[PDB]
XYZ file of N, CA and C in Angstrom:
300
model
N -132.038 35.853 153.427
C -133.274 35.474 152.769
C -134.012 36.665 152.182
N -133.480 37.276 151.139
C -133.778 38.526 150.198
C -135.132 38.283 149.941
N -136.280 39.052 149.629
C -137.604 38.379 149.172
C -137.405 39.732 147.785
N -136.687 40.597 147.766
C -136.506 41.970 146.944
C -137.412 41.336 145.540
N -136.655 40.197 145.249
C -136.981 39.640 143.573
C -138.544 39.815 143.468
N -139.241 39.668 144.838
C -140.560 39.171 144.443
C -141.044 40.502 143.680
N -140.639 41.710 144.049
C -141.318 42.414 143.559
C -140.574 43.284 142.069
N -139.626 42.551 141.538
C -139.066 42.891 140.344
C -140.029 42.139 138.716
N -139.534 43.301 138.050
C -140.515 43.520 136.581
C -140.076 41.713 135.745
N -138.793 41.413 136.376
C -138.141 40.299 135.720
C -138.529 38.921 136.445
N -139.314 39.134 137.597
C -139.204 37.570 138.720
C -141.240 37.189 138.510
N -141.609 36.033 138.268
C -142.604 35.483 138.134
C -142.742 34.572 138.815
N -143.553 34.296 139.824
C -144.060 33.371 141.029
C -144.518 32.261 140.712
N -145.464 31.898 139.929
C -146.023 30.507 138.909
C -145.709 30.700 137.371
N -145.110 30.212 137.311
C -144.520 29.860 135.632
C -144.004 28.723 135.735
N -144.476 27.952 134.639
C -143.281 27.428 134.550
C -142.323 27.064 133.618
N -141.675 25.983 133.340
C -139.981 26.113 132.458
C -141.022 26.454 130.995
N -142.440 25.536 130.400
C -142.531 25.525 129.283
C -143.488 27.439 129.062
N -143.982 27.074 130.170
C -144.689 28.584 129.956
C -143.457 29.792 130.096
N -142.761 29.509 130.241
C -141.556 31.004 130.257
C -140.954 30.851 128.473
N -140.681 29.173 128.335
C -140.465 29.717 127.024
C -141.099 29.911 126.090
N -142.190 29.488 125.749
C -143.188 30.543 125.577
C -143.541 32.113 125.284
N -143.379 32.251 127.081
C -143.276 34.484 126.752
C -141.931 34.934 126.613
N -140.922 33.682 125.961
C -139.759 34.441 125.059
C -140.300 34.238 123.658
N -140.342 33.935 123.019
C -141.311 33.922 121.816
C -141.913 34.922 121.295
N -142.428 35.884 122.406
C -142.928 36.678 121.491
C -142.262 38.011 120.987
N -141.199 38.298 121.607
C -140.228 39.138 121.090
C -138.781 38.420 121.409
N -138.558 37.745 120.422
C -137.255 37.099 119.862
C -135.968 37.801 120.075
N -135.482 37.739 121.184
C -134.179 38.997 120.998
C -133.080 38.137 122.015
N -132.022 38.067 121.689
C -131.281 37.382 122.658
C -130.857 38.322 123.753
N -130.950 38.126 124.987
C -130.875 39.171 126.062
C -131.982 38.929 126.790
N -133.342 38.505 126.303
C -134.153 39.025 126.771
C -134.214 37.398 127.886
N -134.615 37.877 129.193
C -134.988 37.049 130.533
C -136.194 36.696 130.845
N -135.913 36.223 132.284
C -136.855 36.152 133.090
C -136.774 34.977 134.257
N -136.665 35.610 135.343
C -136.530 34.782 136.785
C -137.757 33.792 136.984
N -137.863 32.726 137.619
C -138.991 31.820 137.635
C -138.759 30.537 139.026
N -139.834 30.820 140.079
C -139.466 29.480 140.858
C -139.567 28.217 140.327
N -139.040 27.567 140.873
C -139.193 26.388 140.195
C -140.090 25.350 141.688
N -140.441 24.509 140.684
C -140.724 23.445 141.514
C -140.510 22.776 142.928
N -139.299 22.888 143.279
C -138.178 22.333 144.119
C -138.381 23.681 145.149
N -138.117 23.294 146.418
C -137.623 24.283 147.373
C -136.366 24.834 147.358
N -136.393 25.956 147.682
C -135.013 27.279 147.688
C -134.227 26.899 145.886
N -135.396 27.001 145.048
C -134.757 27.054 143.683
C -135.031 27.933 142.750
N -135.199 28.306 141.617
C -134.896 28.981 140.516
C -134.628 29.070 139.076
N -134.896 29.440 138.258
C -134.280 29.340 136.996
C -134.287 30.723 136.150
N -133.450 30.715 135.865
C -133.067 31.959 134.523
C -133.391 31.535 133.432
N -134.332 32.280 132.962
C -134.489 31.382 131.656
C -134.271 32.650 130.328
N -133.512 32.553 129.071
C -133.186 33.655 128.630
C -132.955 33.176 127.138
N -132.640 34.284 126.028
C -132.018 34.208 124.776
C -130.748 34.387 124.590
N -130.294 33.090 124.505
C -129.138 33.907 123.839
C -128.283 32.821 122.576
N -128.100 33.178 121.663
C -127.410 32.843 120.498
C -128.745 32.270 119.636
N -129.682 32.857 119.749
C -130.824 32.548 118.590
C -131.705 31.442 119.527
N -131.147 31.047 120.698
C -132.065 30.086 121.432
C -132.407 30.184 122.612
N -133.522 29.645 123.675
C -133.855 29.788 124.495
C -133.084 28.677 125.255
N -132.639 29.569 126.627
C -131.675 28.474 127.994
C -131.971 28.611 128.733
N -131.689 27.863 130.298
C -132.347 27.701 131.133
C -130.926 27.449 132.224
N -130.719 28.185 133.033
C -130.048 28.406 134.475
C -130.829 28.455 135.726
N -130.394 26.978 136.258
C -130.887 26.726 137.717
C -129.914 27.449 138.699
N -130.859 28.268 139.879
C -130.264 28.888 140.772
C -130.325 28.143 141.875
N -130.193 28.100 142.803
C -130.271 27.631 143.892
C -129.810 28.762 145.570
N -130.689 28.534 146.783
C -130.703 29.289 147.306
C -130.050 28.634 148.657
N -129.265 28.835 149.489
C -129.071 28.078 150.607
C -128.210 29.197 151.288
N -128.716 28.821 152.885
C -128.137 30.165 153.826
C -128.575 31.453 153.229
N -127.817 32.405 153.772
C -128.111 33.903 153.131
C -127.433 34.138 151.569
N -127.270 33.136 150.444
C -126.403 33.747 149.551
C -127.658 33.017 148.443
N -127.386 33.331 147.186
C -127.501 32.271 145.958
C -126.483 31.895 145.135
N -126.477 30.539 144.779
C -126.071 30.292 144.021
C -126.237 30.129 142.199
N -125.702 30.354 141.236
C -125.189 30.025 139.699
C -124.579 29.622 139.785
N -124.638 27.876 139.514
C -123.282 27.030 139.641
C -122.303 27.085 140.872
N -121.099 27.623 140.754
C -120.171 28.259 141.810
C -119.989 29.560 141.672
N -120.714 30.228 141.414
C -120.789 31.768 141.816
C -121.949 32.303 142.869
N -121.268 33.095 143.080
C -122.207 33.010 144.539
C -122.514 34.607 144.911
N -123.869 35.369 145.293
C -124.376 36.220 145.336
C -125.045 36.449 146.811
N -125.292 37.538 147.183
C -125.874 37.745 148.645
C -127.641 37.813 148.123
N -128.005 37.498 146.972
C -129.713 37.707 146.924
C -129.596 37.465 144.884
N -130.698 37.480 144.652
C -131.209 36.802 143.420
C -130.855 38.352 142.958
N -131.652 39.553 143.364
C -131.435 40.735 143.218
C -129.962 41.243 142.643
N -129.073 41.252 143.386
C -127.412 41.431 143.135
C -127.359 40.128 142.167
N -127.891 39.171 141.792
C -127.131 38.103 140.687
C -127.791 38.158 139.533
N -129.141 38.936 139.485
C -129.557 39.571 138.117
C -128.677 41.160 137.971
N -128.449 42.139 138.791
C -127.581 42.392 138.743
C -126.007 42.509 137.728
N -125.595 41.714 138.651
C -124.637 40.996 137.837
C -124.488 40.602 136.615
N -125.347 40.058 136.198
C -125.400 39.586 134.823
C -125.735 40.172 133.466
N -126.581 41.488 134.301
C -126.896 42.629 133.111
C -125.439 43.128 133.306
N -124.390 43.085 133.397
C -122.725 43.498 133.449
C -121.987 42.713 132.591
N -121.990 41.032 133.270
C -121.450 40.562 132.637
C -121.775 39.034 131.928
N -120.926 38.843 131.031
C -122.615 37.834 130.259
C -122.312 36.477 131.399
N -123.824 35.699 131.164
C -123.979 34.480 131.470
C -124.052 33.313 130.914
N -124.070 33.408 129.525
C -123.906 32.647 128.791
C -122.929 33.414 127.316
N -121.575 32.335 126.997
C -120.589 32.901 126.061
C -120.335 34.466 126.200
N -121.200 35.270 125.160
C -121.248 36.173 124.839
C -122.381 37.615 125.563
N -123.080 36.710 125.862
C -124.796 37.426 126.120
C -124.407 37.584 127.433
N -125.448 38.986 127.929
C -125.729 39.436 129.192
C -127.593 39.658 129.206
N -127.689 39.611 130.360
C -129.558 39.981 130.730
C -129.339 41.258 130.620
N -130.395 41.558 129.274
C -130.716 43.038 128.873
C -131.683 43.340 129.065
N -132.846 42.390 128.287
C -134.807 42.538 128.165
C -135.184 41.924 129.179
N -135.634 42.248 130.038
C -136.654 41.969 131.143
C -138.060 41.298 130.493
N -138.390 40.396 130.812
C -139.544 40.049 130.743
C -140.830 40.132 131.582
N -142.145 40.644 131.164
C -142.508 41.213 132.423
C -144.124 40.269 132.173
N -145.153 41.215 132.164
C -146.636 41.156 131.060
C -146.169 40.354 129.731
């Protein structure tokens, strides 16, 4: 049960799905993120640019790991991580952090 995210430039505590896309909007760049609880208990969403549009990846948290779909991570931390490596959607990887 990692809490690390809470204090990353990319993870936002109240947002939500329409207000995140939103603060992609204002610098248009595919890459650019941002972590967000969601509604639901032990959940999540990635919400990001990529191919000229804004998407949305539900995480999910159970036991000590997280989940993306069937990939599976020891903390939200290591699965943003991850993804600035290798992309998460087609082509794209998390580059721009979304912060302010």
């Amino acid at each position: 049960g990692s809490h690390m995210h809470e204090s990353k430039e990319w993870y936002h505590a109240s947002l939500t799905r329409a207000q995140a896309e939103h603060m992609l909007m204002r610098v248009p760049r595919d890459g650019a993120f941002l972590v967000r609880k969601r509604n639901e208990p032990n959940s999540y969403a990635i919400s990001f640019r990529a191919e000229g549009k804004i998407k949305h990846c539900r995480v999910q948290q159970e036991g000590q790991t997280v989940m993306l779909g069937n990939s599976e991570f020891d903390s939200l931390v290591d699965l943003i991580s991850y993804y600035e490596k290798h992309p998460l959607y087609r082509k794209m990887k998390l580059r721009y952090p979304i912060n302010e």
